[PDB]
């Protein structure tokens, strides 16, 4: 695959890690968000599925101060809140 158009706050996140376009696949969106979390070291060092997004644009995007990478449906749901799906 689907093409998506990130809303502005997600766009700013994507761009802070090198993405320069306005339309993405979900795969690109997940890759860049992954890069954002890794590069900013937002994950718990001991339990690396835990991500802290408070005090960060990611927390404003997601609306939660923390989440677990294992929470697949919650992650996608949060991402979709911040995307318009093409078509």
């Amino acid at each position: 695959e689907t093409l998506v158009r990130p809303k502005p706050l997600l766009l700013k996140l994507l761009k802070s890690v090198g993405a320069q376009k306005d339309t993405y696949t979900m795969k690109e969106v997940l890759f860049y968000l992954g890069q954002y979390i890794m590069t900013k070291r937002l994950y718990d060092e001991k339990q690396q599925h835990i991500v802290y997004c408070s005090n960060d644009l990611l927390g404003d995007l997601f609306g939660v101060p923390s989440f677990s990478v294992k929470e697949h449906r919650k992650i996608y749901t949060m991402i979709y809140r911040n995307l318009v799906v093409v078509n």
Binding site: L30, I37, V69, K70
Partner: peptide
């Protein structure tokens, strides 16, 4: 289990 390993299961 590394962050990278976890992130991959999302795909």
């Amino acid at each position: 289990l590394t962050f990278e390993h976890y992130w991959a299961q999302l795909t």
